[PDB]
Every structure is written in structure tokens, then in C-alpha cells.
Amino acid sequence: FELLHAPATVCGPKKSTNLVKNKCVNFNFNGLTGTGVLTESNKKFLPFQQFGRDIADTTDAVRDPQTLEILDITPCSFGGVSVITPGTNTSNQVAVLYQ
Amino acid sequence: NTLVKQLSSNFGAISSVLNDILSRLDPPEAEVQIDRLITGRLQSLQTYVT
């Protein structure tokens, strides 16, 4: 058997849940897993195409094999932590700054 | 753009995605495939900083 070469039509004994949008939850389309926010789509896709790669070679939009709806993929891992303190000799307070 | 292309190379492995190898190989046997992806990226990061 092959791995990731054609639209899903065999697979194995796996059920299905509901579809939630505007959330950074884990998804699983065509066996390939991932983590990102699934929102609306405004691009153009052909009926015989499923996955899609950009310049970074990352699945940004996968087609739902259940409803044939294009959903964009965008991970919420976008931030940083930076603590700024004036010094322990003055006071004992800090300032939480995000990147 | 050079570091972006390093994420797609296998560096002598079977897959360049960390979510794909774990879904097909058991941890006690996938240690030989994850090490090839980590070692292949340390050379690009060391060269970039240099």
C-alpha cells in the first residue's frame, strides 16, 4: 500500500466528530494531523486536488473529505515572553511584556 | 529562504514532518529517524549563525 498519494477512500476503522471553527485545536485530515485555526477560505481549488503547499511547503488549506469544504490552516503559536525589571535593589515588581 | 528549504529535506530519512513519523513508527524504533532530522538542522543553524 502507498502513503499519502491519492484522495482518501479506504483508510481504516475510524469514526468522525463535529467541525469547530475559530479555534486553535488539533485537526486530522486524510490521516495527516496538525494544529491550527480552521476558518473560511477565499482561494480557488480544483475538484481533483486535495492538499496544497505554499512557499514554505506547509499544508495551508486541506479539503474536508466529508463535506468538500476548503478550510485554511493557521497555527496560533505566534508570540513571546519578555520580562523587564528595574532591579532588585529598588522595588520587587516586574513588567510582563509580550513580543 | 535557505533555512525554509531545510524543513522539507529528509537528510537521509523517510519523512520531513514530525507529525508523520510518530503516526507510523513506534517510539522505541523511531529514534533513528528523528535523530537524522535534528542533526541535519543543527548544521544549517550553526552555518547561519556563523
Binding site: I55, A56, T58 | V4, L7
Partner: peptide, 28 residues
């Protein structure tokens, strides 16, 4: 409206993927 001269505005036009690169660790 800006605090620049006409010479500085002419040189700015001579010297001319934002969030996609930041999804891997490239923080500007």
C-alpha cells in the same frame, strides 16, 4: 505632514511571507 524633507522622501522610494516566516521561529 511628516518631519522629513524633499530629499529624504526621494531616497526612500529608491530603496524598496511576513507572517509565514514567523511561524517557524524567525522573529523580527
Amino acid at each position: 505632514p511628516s518631519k522629513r524633507s524633499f530629499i529624504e522622501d526621494l531616497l526612500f522610494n529608491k530603496v524598496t511571507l511576513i507572517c509565514a516566516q514567523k511561524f517557524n521561529g524567525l522573529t523580527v
